[PDB]
Amino acid sequence: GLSDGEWQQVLNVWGKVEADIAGHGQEVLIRLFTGHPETLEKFDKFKHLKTEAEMKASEDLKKHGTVVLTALGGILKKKGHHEAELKPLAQSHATKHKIPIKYLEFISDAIIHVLHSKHPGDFGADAQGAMTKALELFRNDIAAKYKELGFQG
Numbered sequence: 778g779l780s781d782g783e784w785q786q787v788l789n790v791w792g793k794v795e796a797d798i799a800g801h802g803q804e805v806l807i808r809l810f811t812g813h814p815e816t817l818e819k820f821d822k823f824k825h826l827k828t829e830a831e832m833k834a835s836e837d838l839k840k841h842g843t844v845v846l847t848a849l850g851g852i853l854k855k856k857g858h859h860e861a862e863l864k865p866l867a868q869s870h871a872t873k874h875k876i877p878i879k880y881l882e883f884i885s886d887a888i889i890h891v892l893h894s895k896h897p898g899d900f901g902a903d904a905q906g907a908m909t910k911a912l913e914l915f916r917n918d919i920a921a922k923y924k925e926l927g928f929q930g
């Protein structure tokens with residue numbers, strides 16, 4: 778789906794995220810929850826936050842941000858050879874958490890936003906292109922598994 782040049786770019790940009798996984802994970806979820814409040818309702822653990830400050834002051838939220846970006850980075854490093862790591866993710870988000878693919882679209886966008894916000898001027902046009910394509914691949918692969926399950930919506 779990606780060329781090696783493009784994968785190269787994706788892992789170059791991920792090295793930025795690894796320098797501060799918690800801070801990046803934290804802003805991704807906050808971006809998600811403030812931009813799309815209905816997503817917050819999917820989490821009994823966080824439905825009590827109402828304000829962004831509140832969100833910002835939550836250590837549990839920073840904790841979950843780390844789990845999420847840890848699991849994505851594991852998949853990205855497989856450079857599309859992630860059937861093994863993705864299957865379990867697709868199955869729990871579909872049958873247990875009941876996360877529509879649209880919310881995966883949302884978080885995907887949130888990642889690109891956050892990268893530009895935290896690295897203004899050094900998140901280039903080529904890097905944005907490779908990252909967008911890798912997120913698309915990720916999402917597309919989940920979508921296939923959602924279809925298999927008939928997770929219709």
Ligand code: HEM
Nearest residue numbers: 816819820822844845848849865866869874876880881884
């Ligand atoms: C970048 C895409 C995502 C990744 C890598 C990711 C990763 C994870 C992981 C690894 C877990 C814990 C193990 C599991 O339950 O499978 C989890 C739990 C969960 N995820 Fe995701 N997630 C993503 C997107 C989303 C989105 C978009 C939503 C809702 C808008 C969501 C909702 C949840 C919920 C409700 C849980 C259970 C949390 C708890 O109560 O501890 N996830 N996620």
